Amino acid sequence: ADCQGWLYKKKEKGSFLSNKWKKFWVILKGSSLYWYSNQMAEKADGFVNLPDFTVERASECKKKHAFKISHPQIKTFYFAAENVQEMNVWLNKLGSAVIHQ
Incomplete structure (x- = not known):
């Protein structure tokens, strides 16, 4: 795995103003x-x-510490980390994972 950790994920269609998000164990491996x-x-x-x-x-x-991943034919997803340090690792690793030949 290129990164792993706990992240909250916003419910689909849920308000941006809600703080009730479910917590998952999340793994990045290559581009998935x-x-x-x-x-x-x-x-x-x-x-x-x-x-x-x-x-x-x-x-x-x-x-707090939320970020967005989006694609026009698939979906838009919102995740959040417990603190800024962990958020920054995810932004680092995901930004590399969306690039391809």
């Missing part, structure tokens, strides 16, 4: 991102292939 219910689950709850996604800070969310 996976979210699991906990650290022992064999099968993830979801995944996305990152080529051509954009990655940005999301200060429009009330939840």
Whole structure:
């Protein structure tokens, strides 16, 4: 794995003003991102292939330390870390993972 850690994920269609987000164990491997219910689950709850996604800070969310990943044919996802240091690692690693030949 290129990165792993706990992240909150905003419910689909949920208000930017809500702080009720579910916490997942998240793994980045190459250009794919996976979210699991906990650290022992064999099968993830979801995944996305990152080529051509954009990655940005999301200060429009009330939840602190939030960021946005988006693609026009797939989906827009909002995640948040517990603190700025962890957020910065994710921004570092995801920005590399969306680039391709």
